[PDB]
Amino acid sequence: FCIDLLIKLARTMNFTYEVHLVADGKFGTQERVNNSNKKEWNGMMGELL
Amino acid sequence: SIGIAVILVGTSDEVAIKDAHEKDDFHHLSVVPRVELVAMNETDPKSIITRICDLMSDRKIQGVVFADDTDQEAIAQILDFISAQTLTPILGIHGGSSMIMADKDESSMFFQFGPSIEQQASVMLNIMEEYDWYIFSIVTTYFPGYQDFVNKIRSTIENSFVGWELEEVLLLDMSLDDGDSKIQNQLKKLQSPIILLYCTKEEATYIFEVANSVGLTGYGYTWIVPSLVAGDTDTVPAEFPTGLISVSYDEWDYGLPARVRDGIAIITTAASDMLSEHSFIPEPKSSCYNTHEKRIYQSNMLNRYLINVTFEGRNLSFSEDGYQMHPKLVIILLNKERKWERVGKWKDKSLQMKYYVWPRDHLSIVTLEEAPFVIVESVDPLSGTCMRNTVPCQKR
Amino acid sequence: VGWELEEVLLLDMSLDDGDSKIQNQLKKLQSPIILLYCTKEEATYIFEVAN
Amino acid sequence: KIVNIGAVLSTRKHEQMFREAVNQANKRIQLNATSVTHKPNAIQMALSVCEDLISSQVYAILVSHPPTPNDHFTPTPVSYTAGFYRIPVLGLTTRMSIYSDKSIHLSFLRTVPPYSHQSSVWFEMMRVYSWNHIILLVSDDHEGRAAQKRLETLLEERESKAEKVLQFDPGTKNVTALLMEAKELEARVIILSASEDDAATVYRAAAMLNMTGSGYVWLVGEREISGNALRYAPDGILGLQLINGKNESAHISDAVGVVAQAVHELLEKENITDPPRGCVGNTNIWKTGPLFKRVLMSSKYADGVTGRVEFNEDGDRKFANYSIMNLQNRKLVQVGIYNGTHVIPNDRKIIWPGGETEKPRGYQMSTRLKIVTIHQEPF
Question: Where would I find glycosylation on this chain (chain A)?
Answer without folding.
Answer: 14, 34
